[PDB]
Amino acid sequence: SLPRPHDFFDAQTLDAIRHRAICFNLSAHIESLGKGHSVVFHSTVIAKRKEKLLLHWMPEDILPDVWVNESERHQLKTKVVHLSKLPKDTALLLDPNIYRTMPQKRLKR
Amino acid sequence: SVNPNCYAKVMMVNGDHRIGIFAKRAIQTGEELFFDYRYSQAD
Amino acid sequence: KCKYSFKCVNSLKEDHNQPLFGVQFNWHSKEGDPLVFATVGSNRVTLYECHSQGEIRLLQSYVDADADENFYTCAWTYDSNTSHPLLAVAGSRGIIRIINPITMQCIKHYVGHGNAINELKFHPRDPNLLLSVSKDHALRLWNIQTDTLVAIFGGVEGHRDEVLSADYDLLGEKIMSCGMDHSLKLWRINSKRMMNAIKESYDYNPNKTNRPFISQKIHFPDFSTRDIHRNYVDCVRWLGDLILSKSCENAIVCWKPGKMEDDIDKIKPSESNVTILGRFDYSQCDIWYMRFSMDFWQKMLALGNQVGKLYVWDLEVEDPHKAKCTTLTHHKCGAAIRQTSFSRDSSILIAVCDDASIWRWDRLR
Amino acid sequence: PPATQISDLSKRKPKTEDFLTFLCLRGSPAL
Amino acid sequence: DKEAAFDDAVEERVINEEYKIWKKNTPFLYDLVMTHALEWPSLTAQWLPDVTRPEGKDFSIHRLVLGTHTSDEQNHLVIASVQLPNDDAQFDASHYDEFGGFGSVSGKIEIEIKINHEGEVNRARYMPQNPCIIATKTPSSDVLVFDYTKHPSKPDPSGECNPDLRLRGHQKEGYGLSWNPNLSGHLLSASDDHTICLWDISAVPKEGKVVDAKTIFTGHTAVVEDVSWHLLHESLFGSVADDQKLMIWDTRSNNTSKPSHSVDAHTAEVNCLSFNPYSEFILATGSADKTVALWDLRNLKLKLHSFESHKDEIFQVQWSPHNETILASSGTDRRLNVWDLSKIGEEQSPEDAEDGPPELLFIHGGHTAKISDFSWNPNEPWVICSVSEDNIMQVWQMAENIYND
Amino acid sequence: WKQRRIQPVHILTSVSSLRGTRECSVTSDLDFPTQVIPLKTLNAVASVPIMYSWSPLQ
Amino acid sequence: QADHELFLQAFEKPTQIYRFLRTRNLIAPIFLHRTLTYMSHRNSRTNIKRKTFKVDDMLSHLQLTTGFFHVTLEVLLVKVCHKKRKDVSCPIRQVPTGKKQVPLNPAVSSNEFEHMVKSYSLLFRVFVAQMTVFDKNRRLQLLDGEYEVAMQEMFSQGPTLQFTLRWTRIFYQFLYNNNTRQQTEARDDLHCPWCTLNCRKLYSLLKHLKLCHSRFIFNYVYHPKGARIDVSINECYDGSYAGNPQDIHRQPGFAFSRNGPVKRTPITHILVCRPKRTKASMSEFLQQRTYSSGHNRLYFHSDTCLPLRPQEMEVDSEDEKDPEWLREKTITQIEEFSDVNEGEKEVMKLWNLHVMKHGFIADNQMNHACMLFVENYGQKIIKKNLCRNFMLHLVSMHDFNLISIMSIDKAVTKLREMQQKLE
């Protein structure tokens, strides 16, 4: 019979997808400690409250930095958040391979 | 195919033999045609 | 005996480790610009740049292993609008890819061949004319500048079998095409129709007109012969006004069309008695699909050998083919050379084996 | 039986220095 | 830049793979899957209310107005003939092939009238009172009104057929158009020149080759991407532009610069606007802020359950006339997001919240390019027709399994 | 040939794994270090079924 | 090991491709899996439209401060926004402050902020300092309490400016053409390993895998303890280009570039006619016959392998009664005669070419054929002066019937005008 016409996907973008996935895993390890369905991150004490603390997370506009109590920070320094609950404002800035308009450069309107 | 949509019949025109291709059924627009090779020498 | 003496500088290898067919030097490079060449193999083409003092280096390597592709030719050219070197590659499936090593991006892809493209050559007067001797029992002339099929040589009495390679004259006045049908027919480009079609393609645009490009199918060549080579002929060239065609007869016979006195340009199409003058003879070179090449000044003609030996022919001297010339041997030559290429200046030549392992030589000068 | 399927299979898209150690850094793709 | 082209290629193949995946869930999500690719590329869709189901032909005579979006080859205006499976769909019936339940051979998508056009066709809004008159929007300053019956079929090898009604009131390219269901005529058109134009039409004078704009609504600073009337009440309509104001304009108010409703309703560009006949108060609007939000006519300052589910500019919203608590929205995200209010302000299982907002119910993902128009079927309850810029016109019905009891 | 020059082809060694993909292994047989170059993969094109040339006739 | 390593790589590559495709599906799914009528296990929310839409309304100061620990400094604001259509990147506006002669290793908050802007943040310079003032989820951050805010190079041991901040048993079997199975378990109850989907039971996973991951073919086999599911890439996988076929063979830099409008042939497709809307069956876990109409493909030119544009569909018959090579062969054969005269050869070539190019088969029209020579070639016969040869040839047909004496007279008189016109 006639074989598959042509694999339009993965002709050239397979390596770009691997690079993006490598960057994502190295930055967040969401596939390792994020349980696959949530964002894994590492926190550090950038700020604190004279008496709470600020376990700021490294990825900017990906895993938001929150404010927690001193004992609360010392216990749950790392917060794991589902991608479903991630904000929609910075999700687009998190990675450019999720949704970007292809033909919007011209025509469109 | 075993169920062609066309058939061949040779007709003698003006003292000459010329093969004419004829449709077996009402063929709708734009499909891939057929012809039973068993009719010809090369089946 | 010849007044030439080359010396090897340095070599290299390739990632794919596959046979390499298409190889030429960048003869279009002028003084000052370091010499470069190209080689092919598997689905990954590789370039290189080897400096003086016996040193070699690599610069680029493009892979096209998305499908089961394969490369056959690496014809060199250049783009007048950009003054950048170009490298056209084709084979296997039959897509003519025009790589641009400077920007490392593909430029043009060409479809329409019924089988694998076997050879490629460029028009000396116009760098935009590439001759593709396709395997579909025909030969094709493409116009890269306007992306049209200028002329489809073949028809009722043309290319009974696959056309392997076709060359150009000293000025490109006449075209000969060796083939697999024992044919050496000279599809001349001297008729007025060919020039008119070339001009039309020069001022043609597929967007402008709805109808396709009206190609010219040359069913009948301006001259033909079937008795010079007993077997199929794979390489052809134009030694001056004579013919430098080559077949599996381990000889590049230097014959002339017609009788011994009649002009080639005025030979009648019905002539059936050509005359042979001489042939350069060697041994252990009986394999098929190999390409030979002379220099720019025609004084040095070279052909590869499957054993590994290399030959250079001195043709600037008087008289027809004679003497014994010089044979070049390399310390690391074990495989089959598929294409040899000198430089524009008589200083540098590199042979390429069936592992994309270029061995570059430098003449004493 | 490498417990969770992710920890042994999804370590193929990040198949370089992004596996975050764990069983992925070990012989997860192989036996 | 090389990176931009690389990303565009990656996203193009990603969209292709997503569409190929979406094809497989056709039987388990919808009821009918009809998609016909117009010869002249699709840019608009509509639904003429003509219906006829003769005895022995269970299919109803269905007509839809397609578009023409090629560069320039004798630009046309295509009207195709479509069919519906009806109650006796005859899934197999040992006779599926035309099928025993509907037309499955010969005139499945047959063309009826193809009048030549001069330029592009943007909208295909017909007069619902008299389905014979069909309008068209062109890049020129004038709109085109045709008549598929008066104009002959089988166009000659020539273009720019005279439509006998050219409404020239605009200046720049037009992109919006809507008719008045209650009153015959009153075609409102919104263009890119920051204005919305009104043509009275109706009692068109004989040999009306030139028609001036009866009224012009130029109150939005930026380009109005769509203007739609209120389905329940014909004395008022709504306008919206890039200035982030899903305004509502009341006709015969003696004020063409200040809209009656000045609710911003967003912060970024807002393009779409519609209403609902059954839901006399529930509305919808598409926007750049990806925050299509229902609004109440009596209480519009407050925000209802903002269906924050889009991902970019939305160019089209509409609500189903058949039901009451169903709306829809499509835009540049090549998704026709169908809204639902009966689940607004309510909770559910965690998996239900993971799927999305409980209020949002359906989203159609069978497009590869930007959606330019979509419409429900007036006759059939769930049948939806949506078009994009990939030259694909689809007719489909959302599954009735979910809305049982 | 000597009428006009050409643009100097520096033949620069591309980049050093710009996309983080596989790199070339040019293991020079002579005593030279192996050169590494990212494999700049090129896009593919749709093929065509094989056939031969035929003579039109009526 | 050689073959083994190659097989491992050639199994990974399709598995890896599907992995990235599913992670993209994991990152952003396309359609709500709850609307799938068969996937009733998950998202079993209440379905009661009694809550009609008519009930819509009811239903729906800081005082900071010191010096670095190890100099005029300024505090700037860094703002992240939403990437709109006009601007590819999010606009950033900077609102810095003044400088003070703070001691080198020995503040009152302003109403700069207070919905286009996503968030408000402030960054110090002491010589840089980056902080996360506001979370991306509008969560509380940079709250009250004095802290030694460390300054990033280029509390902590690094330099800081002390500021008193205040308020405001399931078994999977991966396969490829039945090569070699795999052994992977499950994490969550009926969780899809590729993309996270907590199916409540197999009724939201069984056909979900097939109808949502078309790249794989699933053969559920059931397990005594749990559910056993196999995964293998479908060989056919008609996932090629699904748009305009004219962009498949376009030149690089223009293929699939979706630059602008392209003409295409009409096509009608239908593949979901009428689902039975029946209940679940176990035997289902243990023909399509799609409908197509019209021209849904790209065509080729007859002479060569060159593709035929849809604009070239008008006639493009490429059939000819007298092809050019036929005329050339006829001329060559006529001029190659060994026992013919020059005028005889010329007139014979003329008549043979006329007969081939006109394809006369009608016997009576053969008489009219003798007239046709006058219609077009009269100037050529006048110039070449071939009156005698033409007359002899015209006479040389009564031996085979056809024509008559009257036709001969008519033809001779008709040509006589041409010679007399020259005369």
Q: Are C90 and C97 in contact (CB under 8 A)?
A: yes
CA distance G393 to G334: 15
Rounded Cα distance between E338 and E363, Å, is 5
Q: How many Cβ atoms from other residues are within 10 Å of residue C182's Cβ?
A: 18
Which of left, alpha, beta for E308 (phi over 0: left; psi -120 to 50: alpha)? Answer: beta
Give φ, ψ of G77 to 5 degrees. -115, 130
Report which residue type is found at C27.
Answer: W
> Phi, psi at residue E288, to the nearest 5°?
-75, -30
G12·D29 Cβ contact <8 A:
yes
Cβ atoms of residues E37 and E378 within 8 Å: no
- Do the Cβ atoms of B29 and G294 come within 8 Å? yes
To which residue do tokens 């300052």 refer?
Answer: E301
The residue type of G241 is Y
Amino acid at E358: P
Tokens for C170? 């000293």
DSSP A16: H
Q: CA geometry: angle at C254 spanning C249 and C259, to 5°?
A: 120
Q: How far apart are CA G49 and CA G51, in angstroms?
A: 5
Question: What are the φ/ψ torsions at residue C221 (nearest 5 degrees)?
Answer: -70, 160
C-alpha–C-alpha distance, residues G190 and G204, integer Å? 8
**Residue A4 is nearest to which of G147, G187, G236, comparing CB atoms?**
G236
Beta-bridged to residue F35, according to DSSP, are F26
What number of other Cβ atoms are within 10 A of residue A108's Cβ? Answer: 13
Integer Cα distance of E125 and E176 in angstroms: 10
- Point out which residues pair with G125 in neighbouring strands: G74
Confirm if C225 and C184 have CB atoms less than 8 A apart.
yes
C-alpha E330 chain-centroid distance: 9
Which 3 state secondary structure label does DSSP give E6? helix
Residues comprising chain F, all counted = 58
Mark yes or no for CB contact F8/C32 under 8 Å: yes
Are E213 and E197 in contact, with CB atoms under 8 Å apart?
Answer: yes
Residues 6 or more apart whose Cβ sits within 8 Å of residue F49:
none
CA distance E171 to E159: 23
Q: Which two three-digit tokens encode residue G347?
A: 């007139």
Sequence-ordered alpha helix ranges (H) in G178-290: 206-212, 282-285
Task: Give the C-alpha separation, G334 to G128, whole Å.
Answer: 96
Rounded to an integer, what distance in angstroms lies between the CA atom of residue C293 and that of residue C342? 8
List the structure tokens of E261: 């409703």
- What is the DSSP-derived secondary structure letter of residue G399? G
Closest CA to E223 of E133, E168, E288, E151: E288
3-state DSSP call for residue E24?
Answer: helix
Reading the block at residue E353, the tokens are: 């919240």
DSSP string, A82-101: ESTTS-HHHHHHH-TTS---
CB neighbour class for G103 (10 Å; exposed up to 12, middle 13-18, buried from 19): exposed
Radius of gyration, CA atoms only, chain B: 12
DSSP string, G40-51: -SS------TTS
Q: What are phi and psi of C200, to 5 degrees?
A: -60, -50
Give the CA distances from residue G194 to residues A28, A107, D12, E69, E313, in Å, rounded to whole numbers and listed in that order. 18, 37, 12, 40, 30
CA distance G312 to G324: 22
DSSP D6: H
Write the single-letter amino acid at E31. D
Domains, chain E, in order of start with CATH, read 8-405 (2.130.10.10)
Q: List the single best residue of A30, A54, A58, A74 to mutate versus G (max G Cβ within 10 A).
A: A54
DSSP 8-class letter at G355:
H
Task: Identify the CATH number of the domain in which residue C71 sits.
Answer: 2.130.10.10
Query: Chain B residues with CB inside 8 Å of G295's CB?
Result: 29-30
Under a CB-based contact definition with an 8 Å cutoff, are residues G219 and G234 in contact? no
Alpha-carbon gap, residue G68 to E26, rounded angstroms = 65
**Contact between G185 and D29 using a beta-carbon 8 Å cutoff:** no
DSSP H/E element including G21: helix G3-27
What does the alpha-carbon distance between residue C14 and residue C45 come to, in Å, rounded to a whole number?
Answer: 9
CA distance G4 to E261: 72
Which amino acid makes up residue E336?
A: L
Q: For residues C129 and E107, give the distance between their C-alpha atoms in angstroms, rounded to a whole number.
A: 50
Q: How far apart are CA G349 and CA G335, in angstroms?
A: 8
Quick one: CA torsion of G419, G420, G421, G423, rounded to 10 degrees? 90
Q: What CA–CA distance (Å, rounded) separates C18 from C355? A: 5
* Residues of B (4-43) whose Cβ lies below 8 Å from G: 14, 28-30
* Neighbouring residues of E194: CB distance < 8 A, sequence distance ≥ 6: E218, E220, E221, E222, E223, E224, E241
Task: Quickly list H helices, G135-233.
Answer: 206-212
Structure tokens at G224: 């005594």
- Both tokens of A64, joined, read 């938001």
- Among residues G245, G290, G285, G231, the alpha carbon closest in space to that of E26 is found at G290
The continuous run of DSSP H or E covering G18 comes out as helix G3-27
Q: Does F58 touch chain G (CB under 8 A)?
A: yes
CA C48/CA F28 separation, integer angstroms: 11
Closest CA to F8 of C38, E274, C84: C84
Q: Residue E367 in contact with residue E392, Cβ under 8 Å?
A: yes
Q: Which of C250, C248, C246, C257 is nearest to C221 (CA)?
A: C257
Cβ separation of D13 and G172 shorter than 8 Å? Answer: no
- Min Cα distance G353 → chain C (Å) is 18
φ and ψ at residue C255, rounded to 5 degrees: -110, 170
What is the maximal distance between C-alpha atoms in chain G?
A: 134
Are F44 and A11 within 8 A, CB to CB? Answer: yes
* DSSP letters spanning E191-254: ETTTEEEEE--SSPPTT---B--SEEE---SS-EEEEEE-SS-TTEEEEEETTT--EEEETTSS
- Euclidean distance between CA atoms G294 and G148, whole angstroms: 74
* Structure token pair of residue A68: 């927690």
Of D1, D5, D13, the CB nearest to G187: D5
String of b and e for E235-252 (b: at least 16 CB within 10 Å)? Answer: ebbbbbbbbbbbbbbbbe
Query: What domain range is C37 assigned to?
Result: 4-365
Tell me the residue length of chain E.
Answer: 405
Name every residue whose Cβ is closer than 8 Å to that of residue C323 and which is 6 or more positions away in sequence: C1, C2, C314, C317
CA atoms within 13 A on the CB side of G97: 19
Contact assessment for residue G146 and residue A59, using Cβ atoms and an 8 Å cutoff: no
Q: Is residue C210 within 8 Å of residue G313, measured between CB atoms?
A: no
User: CA-CA distance, E345 to G50, in Å (whole number)?
Assistant: 14
Experimental method: cryo-EM
The single residue listed with the structure tokens 């015959």 is E184
**Max intra-chain CA distance, chain E:** 64
Q: Is C89 exposed, middle or buried (0-12, 13-18, 19+ CB in 10 A)?
A: buried
The answer to whether C349 and C365 are in contact (CB under 8 A) is no
Rounded to 5°, the CA angle E133-E134-E140 comes to 125
What is each CA distance from E166 to B6, E134, G191, in whole angstroms? 50, 12, 60
Q: Enter the DSSP assignment of E48.
A: B
Strand partners, E199: E187
Question: What is the C-alpha separation between E119 and E304, in angstroms, rounded?
Answer: 42
Query: Phi-psi category of C166—alpha, beta or left, where left has phi over 0 and alpha has psi -120 to 50?
Result: beta
Q: Is the distance from CB of G64 to CB of E335 less than 8 angstroms?
A: no
E401 exposure class (CB count in 10 Å sphere: 0-12, 13-18, 19+): middle
Helix and strand counts by DSSP (H, E) for chain C:
1, 28
For residues G143, G147, G148 and G150, what is the CA-based torsion angle, rounded to 10 degrees?
-20
Tokens of G110: 């302003």
CA C219 from chain centre, in angstroms, equals 23
Facing residue for D10 by CB, picked from A17, A18, A36: A36
Contact C360, C50 (CB under 8 A): yes
d(CA C98, CA F43): 12
Phi, psi (5° rounding) for residue G408?
A: -60, -45
C44-48 and C37-39 beta bridge pairing: antiparallel
What is the rounded CA–CA span in Å between residue E80 and residue E50? 12
Q: Considering only CB atoms, which chain F residues are within 8 Å of G246?
A: none
Q: In chain C, how many domains are there?
A: 1
Cβ-contact E179, E162 below 8 angstroms: no
D to A contact (≥3 Cβ pairs closer than 8 Å): yes
The secondary structure of G75-92 as a DSSP string is: EEE-------SS-SSPP-
CB contact set of E257 (below 8 Å; sequence gap of 6+): E218, E219
Are the beta carbons of G262 and E70 closer than 8 angstroms? yes
Query: What are G83-88's contacts with CB under 8 Å, separation 24+?
Result: G83/A92, G83/A93, G84/E268, G84/E269, G84/E288, G85/A101, G85/A104, G85/E269, G85/E288, G85/E312, G85/E313
Instruction: Give the Cα separation of G336 and G345 in Å (integer).
Output: 9
From chain E, which residues contact A within 8 Å (Cβ)? 6-17, 175, 192, 223, 225, 290, 308, 311-312, 332-333, 353-354, 369-370, 389
Nearest to E371, CA basis, from E401, E319, E332, E327: E332
According to DSSP, the β-strands at C216-218 and C148-153 are: parallel
Q: Are F57 and G303 spatial neighbours (Cβ–Cβ below 8 Å)? A: no
Q: Is the dihedral of CA G131, G133, G139, G144 positive or negative?
A: positive
- Taking residue C149's Cβ as centre, other Cβ atoms within 10 Å add up to 20
Q: Give the residue on G whose Cα is nearest the Cα of D9.
A: G184
Residue contacts between B and G (CB atoms, under 8 Å): 9
**From CA B38, how far away is CA C275, in angstroms rounded?**
53
Supply the angle between the helices G3-27 and E2-24 in degrees, to the nearest 10: 80
d(CA E79, CA E393): 12
**Set of chain E residues whose Cβ sits within 8 Å of the Cβ of A96:** 7
Distance CA E291, CA G117 (A): 15
Given a contact cutoff of 8 angstroms between Cβ atoms, the answer to whether E193 and E171 are in contact is: yes
Judged by DSSP in three states, G285 sits in: helix
The residues, any chain, with a CB within 8 Å of residue F30's CB and separated by 6 or more, are C10, C11, C54, C56, C332
Phi, psi (deg, nearest 5) at residue G309:
-65, 150
G175: three-class secondary structure by DSSP: strand
User: C258 Cβ partners below 8 Å, 6+ apart?
Assistant: C264, C267, C271, C273, C274, C275
| Chains within contact range of chain F (3+ C-beta pairs < 8 Å) | A, C, G
Sorted by sequence, the CB contacts under 8 Å of residue G249 that are 6+ apart come out as C111, F45, F46, F48, G255, G298, G307
Cβ atoms of residues G266 and C73 within 8 Å: no
Q: What is the torsional sign of CA E281, E282, E283, E287?
A: positive
Closest partner CB to F50 (pick from C32, C55, C114): C114
G252 touches chain C (CB under 8 A): yes
G310, G264 Cβ separation under 8 angstroms: yes
Question: Measuring CA to CA, which residue among B30, B42, B37, B29 is closest to residue B4?
Answer: B37
> Hey, are the CB atoms on E312 and A99 less than 8 Å from each other?
yes
Phi then psi for residue C127, to 5 deg, are -70, -5
Q: Return d(Cα E238, Cα E226) in angstroms, integer.
A: 9
